[model samples]
Target: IKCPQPKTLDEFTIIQNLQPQYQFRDYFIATCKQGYQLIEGNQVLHSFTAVCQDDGTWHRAMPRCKIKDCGQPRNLPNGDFRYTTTMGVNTYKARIQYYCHEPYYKMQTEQGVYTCTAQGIWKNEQKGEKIPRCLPVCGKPVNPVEQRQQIIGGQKAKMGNFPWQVFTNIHGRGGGALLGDRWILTAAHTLYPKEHASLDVFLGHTNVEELMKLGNHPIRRVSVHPDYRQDESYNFEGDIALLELENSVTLGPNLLPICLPDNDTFYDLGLMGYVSGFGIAHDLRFVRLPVANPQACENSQNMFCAGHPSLKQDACQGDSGGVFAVRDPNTDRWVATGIVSWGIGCSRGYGFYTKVLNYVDWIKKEME
Candidate 1:
């Protein structure tokens, strides 16, 4: 008599040769195909046996094989990891690179470097102590801007001082912040047409003469919030816009993206943050202001109030889309917490800024 035969199932295989006809007590085996494994309860079943029963039927039911899934790898906070090759299936030895964002450099970890191994695990058999963190390489300015003459009202900014600052010629020569390689985050009302075919974005310089020589980054797209309305008496609710550049700019000592706030914690009432812009003056200037209470803000839902409580210190006309950034004590990085939106009048009362933390989701989606 011949041995019993097992039929092939999807992603499964017969372990031995099949017999045309089988005897009553014949037996066979079944297993998962190559690049696949069996999942039975808590454990993986490499093989299962099948024996002929008294009625000539197989004793055990056929088991299925599942395509191997190595799963996703851990995320690097200020970095990103992606497979080097196009993967139809996440089988074995998939190479990848853990790339860090601007101002953040990859820290060499003993555990991992972005490689999928034979164990179907991403680096260190998935036991790596740490995935890897992107640490900042302090780009200390040679002649720091903060050390320059303070703008009790609005002083001229020094070169390389406001690296994340951007100057746009749209909507009456406004200022903005370079939040990404090709993204300019600014106020929606600052965009006159709400859309533009081409616009100039100047970076890396603090003066109009130096800015003109560097060449302007051409705008590829303009995304203004749909809900923004200047006519609203309730206050400008959504007053933010994102400008996409035709080409991505390279990071340098005088050009970089500033950190955005990670938490919703409001800046303390007395905490001082700096605002950079051209304003009504021809030269770039910096103005210091203290965070004001939310009750002082005309609209708390979409704005954060900031201005000198008694002093005449505030951003004006051309400063429409400038940034309000606070230096983090722990990281020593300038984190942009707000965008210059509107004010009762320059230095006349509290200036309202668009709370950036609220638009984080919208910005991410557009960038993606």
Candidate 2:
């Protein structure tokens, strides 16, 4: 009667008879006491935890695998009329679409592929895409600004062909924010380039041509982010910078620094934001005018992105070095969230921005 009980499966089986069998409802919506669940399936073999909060539900795993080079209009497998799916994350091969870096693939194809008949066409084995014979990653701005506009005195700038004038010709390009005394906050990229330090930053002027004719903001002091990795191009996530002007700028409608968002505000999807700049929008789709557009983007820690379905007006050419602003969901006030960095062809879909809220510390430190 006092014999020791088996410790292996046999013992567990005997104990099982005394235990009540527990059954799960098999709910897709797991009432995971914590409002989260770990899912395992063919697409996701590893257990992934899904959580629900007051804002929305989120999956804490690589929910979807993005194609290696799927940038814009990422295509699906067996969809592209060009080459069939090949190597490198083959399962996501369908995500690759026809987009050229520049110079090499000058000729645009409707099928988004190299006909092989096109001149100077080459494809790289590593990329399984056409390689242009001689492409310049840095060449004359191919896609020019079209329908330019500029705000002179704070009111929304008027739209026109090449409207916004460049304040002055500067060497390096990066994000800039307006501070008192006409100072501009921007990425260290503006000063790191060999020639950037010597360039002048022009503000209060939209037309580059007009800006050049009017005047330029001289570089009083070029401050670089101590952690800025010149070689690594700095992480696109938290990099931020500022520029001190020789004199203070007049605060008005046309010349106002973007209002900063509440410290660490939670970004929600379908958030609206704006992007303005003076760089070409796309590689093939070039605009000869300078223009700005509103973008509806997904709000996240690293980005305050936005865009609309109609795709009517959007940031295109001459929009680099621009600011992306969003309204405080609660107050409906404009808050500068991200800095427009790069995007695919001039399409007005998703636009990525450098999160501004994350760098308040750096901004204060640099400005102080």
Best by lDDT: 1
Task: Please report, in order, the local distance difference test score of every candidate based on alpha carbons.
Answer: 0.69, 0.40
Query: Best by TM-score, which number?
Result: 1
Question: Which pairs of residues collide in model 1?
Answer: none
TM-score of every model?
0.60, 0.44
Q: Residues 133-221, candidate 1, lDDT per residue (tens digit)?
A: 66543323334456344556666777777788888776577778887567888888778533333476788787776787889998888
The segments of candidate 2 whose C-alpha lies over 4 angstroms from its true place after superposition are 1-156, 159-168, 172-175, 193-196, 279-301, 304-318, 329-333, 344-348
Candidate 2 lDDT, tens digit per residue, 1-368? 11121122211111111212212221112211121222233342223223322233222322322112232333422223344445232232232235443321232333354322111122333333543221112111222222154321112333321111223235544335465334565544444532213666665545555545556676666566565555663344434456677765443323444455555643455444445555421111112111123344432345444444334234342244455645354653345566555454335445556667776667767766
Q: List ranges where model 1 is wrong by over 4 Å.
A: 1-151, 193-197, 230-234, 295-299, 313-318
For model 2, give the 10-residue run with minimal summed lDDT.
282-291
How far residue 279's Cα lies from its native spot in candidate 1, in Å, is: 2.7
In candidate 2, residue 140 scores what lDDT? 18
